[PDB]
Amino acid sequence: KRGHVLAVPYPAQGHITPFRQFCKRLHFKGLKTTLALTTFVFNSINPDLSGPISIATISDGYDHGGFETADSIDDYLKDFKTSGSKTIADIIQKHQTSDNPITCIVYDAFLPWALDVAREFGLVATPFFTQPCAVNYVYYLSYINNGSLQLPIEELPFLELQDLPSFFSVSGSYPAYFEMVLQQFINFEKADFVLVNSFQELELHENELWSKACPVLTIGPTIPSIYLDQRIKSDTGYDLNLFESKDDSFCINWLDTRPQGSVVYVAFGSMAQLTNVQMEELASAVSNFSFLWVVRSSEEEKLPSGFLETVNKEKSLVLKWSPQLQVLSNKAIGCFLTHCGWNSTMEALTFGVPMVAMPQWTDQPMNAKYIQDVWKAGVRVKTEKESGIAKREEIEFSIKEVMEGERSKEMKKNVKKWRDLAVKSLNEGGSTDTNIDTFVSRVQ
Ligand SMILES: O=c1ccn([C@@H]2O[C@H](COP(=O)(O)OP(=O)(O)O)[C@@H](O)[C@H]2O)c(=O)[nH]1
Ligand SMILES: *[C@@H]1O[C@H](CO)[C@@H](O)[C@H](O[C@@H]2O[C@H](CO)[C@@H](O)[C@H](O)[C@H]2O)[C@H]1O
Ligand SMILES: *[C@@H]1O[C@H](CO)[C@@H](O)[C@H](O)[C@H]1O
Ligand SMILES: O=C(O)c1ccccc1Br
Separation between Cα atoms, residue 348 and residue 411, nearest integer Å: 12
180 closest CA partner among 297, 304, 78: 78
Distance of CA 183 to the CA centre of its chain: 19
Relative to beta strand 263-267, strand 355-357 is unpaired
Ligand 4 contacts CB of residue 363 (under 6 A): yes
**Alpha-carbon span 61 to 114, nearest angstrom:** 15
> Are the C-beta atoms of residues 256 and 266 closer than 8 Å to each other?
no
CA of 73 to the centre of ligand 2 (A): 10
Instruction: Among 169, 178, 274, 360, name the best residue to mutate to test ligand 3's pocket (greatest count of ligand atoms within 8 A of Cβ).
Output: 360
Q: C-alpha distances in angstroms, 59 versus 96, 125, 346?
A: 20, 20, 30
**15 contact partners, CB below 8 Å, separation of at least 6:** 9, 108, 110, 130
Pair 115, 123: CB distance under 8 Å: no
Residue nearest to atom 25 of ligand 1 (CA): 322
Task: Lay out the sheet containing 317-319: strands in order across.
Answer: 317-319, 290-294, 263-267, 333-338, 355-357, 378-380
Is residue 347 within 8 Å of 218, Cβ to Cβ?
Answer: no
d(CA 210, CA 76): 30
For residue 341, the ligand closest to its alpha carbon is 1
Q: Which of 63, 271, 294 to mutate to test the pocket of ligand 2 (most atoms within 8 A of CB)?
A: 271
Give the gyration radius of the chain's Cα atoms: 21
CB of 352 closer than 6 A to ligand 1? no
CA–CA gap between residue 263 and residue 316 (Å, rounded): 8
* CB of 165 closer than 6 angstroms to any ligand 4 atom: no
CA separation for the pair 126, 106 (Å, rounded): 5
Pairing of strands 317-319, 263-267: unpaired
Cis peptide before 359 (omega within 30 of 0): no
Annotate 201-266 with three-state secondary structure. Answer: HHCHHHHHHHHHHCCCEECCCCCCHHHCCCCCCCCCCCCCCCCCCCCCHHHHHHHHCCCCCCEEEE
Is 113 one of the annotated binding-site residues? no
Residues with Cβ < 8 Å from 276, sequence gap 6 or more?
302
Q: Which atom of ligand 3 is nearest to the CA of 166?
A: 5
Q: Per residue, what are the HEC states of the chain? A: CCCEEEEECCCCHHHHHHHHHHHHHHHHCCCEEEEEEEHHHHHHHCCCCCCCCEEEEECCCCCCCHHHHCCCHHHHHHHHHHHHHHHHHHHHHHHHCCCCCCCEEEEECCCCHHHHHHHHCCCEEEEEECCCHHHHHHHHHHHHCCCCCCCCECCECCCCHHHCCHHHHCCCCCHHHHHHHHHCCCCHHHCCCCEECCCHHHCHHHHHHHHHHCCCEECCCCCCHHHCCCCCCCCCCCCCCCCCCCCCHHHHHHHHCCCCCCEEEEECCCCCCCCHHHHHHHHHHHCCCEEEEECCHHHHHHCCCCCHHHCCCCCCEEECCCCHHHHHHCCCEEEEEECCCHHHHHHHHHHCCCEEECCCCCCHHHHHHHHHHCCCCEEECCCCCCCCCCCHHHHHHHHHHHHCCHHHHHHHHHHCHHHHHHHHHHCCCCHHHHHHHHHHHHHC
Taking the centre of ligand 1 as the mean of its atom positions, its distance from the CA of residue 350, in whole angstroms, is 15
User: Which of 362, 363, 367 should be mutated for ligand 4, with most atoms under 8 A from CB?
Assistant: 362
Distance separating alpha carbons of residues 245 and 320, to the nearest angstrom: 7
Is 148 annotated as ligand-binding?
no
CA distance 88 to 259: 50
Q: What's the rounded Cα separation, in Å, for the pair 401 and 394?
A: 11
* Residue 164 burial (C-beta neighbours within 10 Å; 0-12, 13-18, 19+): buried
Binding site membership of 361 for ligand 3 (Cβ less than 6 Å): yes
Are the CB atoms for 77 and 180 separated by under 8 Å? yes
Domain ranges of the chain: 1-230+425-444, 231-424
Cβ distance 201 to 427 under 8 Å? no
Identity at 343, one-letter amino acid code: N
User: What's the rounded Cα separation, in Å, for the pair 120 and 444?
Assistant: 19
C-alpha 242 chain-centroid distance? 14
Pocket lining: 360 vs ligand 3, CB cutoff 6 Å: yes
Residue 362 known to bind ligand:
yes
Closest CA to 350 of 198, 129, 207: 198
Report the largest interatomic distance among the alpha carbons of the chain, rounded to a whole angstrom.
64
Question: HSE of 4 in the Cβ direction (CA atoms, 13 Å)?
Answer: 15
Q: Which CA distances in Å does 261 have to 173, 233, 251, 293, 337?
A: 39, 28, 16, 15, 14
What is the C-alpha separation between 83 and 65, in angstroms, rounded?
15
Q: Return the closest-CA partner of residue 209 out of 148, 277, 156, 258.
A: 156
What is the CA angle 129-211-171, rounded to 5? 55
* Site to substitute for ligand 4 among 110, 128, 198, most atoms within 8 A of C-beta: 110
d(CA 202, CA 218): 10
Q: Would you tell me which CATH number, out of the four given (3.40.50.2000, 3.30.470.20, 3.20.20.140, 3.90.1720.10), belongs to the domain 231-424?
A: 3.40.50.2000
Contacts for 318 with CB less than 8 Å, ≥ 6 apart? 293, 294, 295, 308, 311
- Contact criterion met (CB below 8 Å) for 364 and 290: no
Residue 21 Cβ inside 6 Å of ligand 3? The answer reads no
Please name which of 420, 398, 395 lies closest in space to residue 408, comparing C-alpha atoms. 398
Q: Is 343 annotated as a binding residue?
A: yes
Among the bound ligands, the one closest to the CA of 270: 1
d(CA 319, CA 96): 45
| 373 Rama class: left (phi>0) / alpha (psi -120 to 50) / beta | alpha
